[PDB]
Design a protein around this nucleic acid. Structure first.
Lengths: 114, 114
DNA sequence: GATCCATGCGCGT
DNA sequence: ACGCGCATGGATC
């Protein structure tokens, strides 16, 4: 695996751990990658699959359209990339478009392994 | 230092084992890189030599063409790169274009080692 | 240290 | 726009 594939795996897990955590916001902000709370690993790939299909806008940023509407990709508003029914919007390839496709096939081989 | 040379080698062998598998599809999905199933090695070299000649279009997706017609390169169409007679249709060079020429030469020089 | 490889920037059609 | 050429860089042993 490369380093950007390694990075996206951590940003998937460290953020999915935050969303599924149902406590006070104070200890929500101390949640880390090494921290042991529940995270959905199927949505981790769903974050990666969309991060495999990025496309930036004219102003060097990512525009993403979901059933709620077209939204910016930033810190507050990246938690809605965890479902499969999310469509991208852009012209050129994203910062990780086509790079994480090999990372998906190794992950689903691990989960669906008997 | 061989990353791009690594995953194309493991993906070609893993996919070729599912192609030549003649059993129930329940145990076809559990076929992996370390699984002891038969794969034709001349198709594996053909697949890597084909991905040496990739040509991604404007949409950063690699369109190919065989005798049945042009096809997108995806998981279900990745078996069509095992044949030699495929020609790419693309506006620009692919992600692995010209990157595995030395990988193929080292692969062929070892297969015909008596 | 060298080999190998990849990413990038510049100049050409 | 894409292709080729060159340069920088870093991954290892």
């Amino acid at each position: 695996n490369d380093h950007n594939q390694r990075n996206v795996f951590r940003q998937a897990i460290t953020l999915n751990k935050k969303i599924h955590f149902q406590g006070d916001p104070a200890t929500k902000e101390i949640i880390s990658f090494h921290s042991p709370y529940y995270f959905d690993i199927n949505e981790v790939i769903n974050y990666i699959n969309n991060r495999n299909n990025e496309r930036k806008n004219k102003d060097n940023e990512h525009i993403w359209s979901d059933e709620e509407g077209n939204f910016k990709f930033d810190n507050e508003n990246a938690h809605r990339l965890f479902k499969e029914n999310v469509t991208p919007d852009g012209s050129s390839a994203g910062a990780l478009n086509g790079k994480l496709l090999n990372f998906v096939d190794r992950l689903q081989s691990k989960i669906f392994d008997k």
